[PDB]
Amino acid sequence: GSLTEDGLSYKEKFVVRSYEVGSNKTATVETIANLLQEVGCNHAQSVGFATTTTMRKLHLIWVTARMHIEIYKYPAWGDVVEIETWCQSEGRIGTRRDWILKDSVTGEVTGRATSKWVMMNQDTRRLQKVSDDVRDEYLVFCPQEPRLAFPEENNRSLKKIPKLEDPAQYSMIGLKPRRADLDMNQHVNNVTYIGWVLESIPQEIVDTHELQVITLDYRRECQQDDVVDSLTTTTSDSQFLHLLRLSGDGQEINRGTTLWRKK
Amino acid sequence: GSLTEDGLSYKEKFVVRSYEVGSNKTATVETIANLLQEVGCNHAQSVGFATTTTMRKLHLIWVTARMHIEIYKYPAWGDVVEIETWCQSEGRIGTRRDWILKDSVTGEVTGRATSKWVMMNQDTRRLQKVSDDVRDEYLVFCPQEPRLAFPEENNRSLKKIPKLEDPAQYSMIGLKPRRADLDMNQHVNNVTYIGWVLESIPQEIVDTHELQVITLDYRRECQQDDVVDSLTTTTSNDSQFLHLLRLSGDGQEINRGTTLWRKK
Ligand SMILES: Cc1ccc(O)c(C(=O)O)c1
Numbered sequence: 163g164s165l166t167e168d169g170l171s172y173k174e175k176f177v178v179r180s181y182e183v184g185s186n187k188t189a190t191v192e193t194i195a196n197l198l199q200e201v202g203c204n205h206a207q208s209v210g211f212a213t214t215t216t217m218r219k220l221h222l223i224w225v226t227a228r229m230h231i232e233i234y235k236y237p238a239w240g241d242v243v244e245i246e247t248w249c250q251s252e253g254r255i256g257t258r259r260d261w262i263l264k265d266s267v268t269g270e271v272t273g274r275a276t277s278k279w280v281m282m283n284q285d286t287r288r289l290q291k292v293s294d295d296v297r298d299e300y301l302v303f304c305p306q307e308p309r310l311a312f313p314e315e316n317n318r319s320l321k322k323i324p325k326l327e328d329p330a331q332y333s334m335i336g337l338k339p340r341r342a343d344l345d346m347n348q349h350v351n352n353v354t355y356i357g358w359v360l361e362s363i364p365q366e367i368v369d370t371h372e373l374q375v376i377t378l379d380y381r382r383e384c385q386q387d388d389v390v391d392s393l394t395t396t397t398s399d400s401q402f403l404h405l406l407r408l409s410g411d412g413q414e415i416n417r418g419t420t421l422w423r424k425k
Numbered sequence: 426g427s428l429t430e431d432g433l434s435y436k437e438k439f440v441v442r443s444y445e446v447g448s449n450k451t452a453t454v455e456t457i458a459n460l461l462q463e464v465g466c467n468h469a470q471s472v473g474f475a476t477t478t479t480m481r482k483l484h485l486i487w488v489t490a491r492m493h494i495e496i497y498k499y500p501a502w503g504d505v506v507e508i509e510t511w512c513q514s515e516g517r518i519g520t521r522r523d524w525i526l527k528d529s530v531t532g533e534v535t536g537r538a539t540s541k542w543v544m545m546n547q548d549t550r551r552l553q554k555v556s557d558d559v560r561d562e563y564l565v566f567c568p569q570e571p572r573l574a575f576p577e578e579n580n581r582s583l584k585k586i587p588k589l590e591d592p593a594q595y596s597m598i599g600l601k602p603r604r605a606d607l608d609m610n611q612h613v614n615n616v617t618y619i620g621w622v623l624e625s626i627p628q629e630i631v632d633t634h635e636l637q638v639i640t641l642d643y644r645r646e647c648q649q650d651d652v653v654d655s656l657t658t659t660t661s662n663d664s665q666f667l668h669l670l671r672l673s674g675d676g677q678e679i680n681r682g683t684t685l686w687r688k689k
């Protein structure tokens with residue numbers, strides 16, 4: 163991995179591994195989600211971070227609010243995938259990290275992703291608008307002209323996800339995170355939520371369709387000792403509405419939509 | 426990754442990733458277990474495989490019977506780890522795949538592993554002895570002189586694991602595999618068993634000790650729609666445990682093992 167010539171984005175090549183591919187011999191969306199996280203961490207480290215000097219002193223962290231992924235073609239085991247990432251400012255709302263997935267040989271675009279991040283106090287789990295003195299430290303690493311992975315005026319990533327009404331058509335109950343589902347700071351990482359959402363997709367859809375789009379709205383963080391229920395309903399290409407909630411009280415932690423295409 | 430000069434072993438370098446490290450900012454044993462699997466798959470592909478032409482004709486596959494891993498130092502996020510693997514013949518019992526983990530910079534040995542594989546009919550799940558026709562096909566890829574990752578006069582990889590008596594000191598109930606826990610053929614990955622075994626280690630031991638040795642004896646394969654119970658008991662500076670994985674309902678054994686932890 164390395165910073166581009168202008169230092170305003172990062173490129174990294176990954177060779178797809180045997181344990182990273184699924185039932186159809188191509189990479190899983192959870193492996194892709196890990197590769198986006200990895201390329202994002204190396205971009206943050208190549209610029210000197212992923213928090214800034216002042217936001218470290220204030221006990222401030224960046225948390226994901228939304229994730230949108232679109233895959234046209236999944237790389238096969240042994241294929242080389244080049245990913246390009248970059249940050250941008252969204253005024254006082256937060257930051258946006260974008261990604262482009264390309265084929266190393268053909269040079270074609272095989273996928274793209276976008277995510278919205280919000281700023282919160284590490285301890286009180288509050289939420290606050292981006293302060294100006296914080297923006298001045300990280301804006302020198304973002305391109306000044308807007309660079310959108312999903313440019314198109316009203317595309318797919320910025321649509322409001324509704325709440326799944328009961329009874330759900332499909333469900334997967336009693337989901338618990340293991341120690342491998344936790345990050346270096348013992349927090350359940352945002353890739354596990356994608357896996358948990360897909361656990362309630364019927365096996366017949368898995369065997370006849372391929373995942374093309376996935377939008378996830380993060381509402382609350384799941385804890386190490388928490389139990390989650392995964393709910394899904396066909397809203398239609400096959401489309402679904404998903405809901406992750408705490409097994410007991412039914413407190414919402416995530417809501418999303420997936421779109422599948424016929425193989 | 427590439428075959429060595431003599432084509433009798435394979436070397437591959439891995440750069441440790443952010444999501445691959447644990448609470449100690451060093452790689453997890455499940456990430457290491459994945460790297461051993463990956464280097465083994467590329468070694469099998471570099472020689473033309475990991476079934477032979479006779480094994481494919483007879484519906485025969487290789488299944489793990491035992492796994493032994495010993496880690497002296499876990500690589501940190503960003504560190505480069507070079508792994509060297511090779512397979513050997515164990516007469517008509519089966520095959521043995523060995524691994525050496527080294528530091529790319531210092532050149533030192535930071536870990537090693539050994540595994541025993543048995544032959545089994547893929548459909549009937551019936552194990553069988555290694556025939557000579559099959560043995561003739563893969564022995565041209567194994568060194569002729571014995572090359573043991575754990576040579577020593579009486580190594581800890583070949584010790585008999587007993588069955589955990591009830592009540593267990595610690596337990597983790599209701600463990601189910603997800604779709605990411607399954608391989609390309611929809612079979613529960615052998616790495617998931619390691620994670621499931623460690624799910625019953627007390628959190629206090631995790632925060633004060635580091636995993637050094639892990640021996641696992643594979644008895645039965647867990648299915649996609651199965652539920653597992655993880656049981657552990659301290660058998661002991663160093664803390665030792667006896668583990669048992671069994672089906673939540675009937676209590677049918679699928680795995681048994683031992684772990685050794687050292688003070689941080
Ligand atoms: C729905 C789903 C979730 C996780 C997976 O690994 C797969 C697959 O391998 O095709 C499918």
Ligand SMILES: Cc1ccc(O)c(C(=O)O)c1
Nearest residue numbers: 341342447448453623626
């Ligand atoms: C006992 C245990 C099991 C799985 C893990 O991933 C770790 C860790 O992250 O430190 C520890």
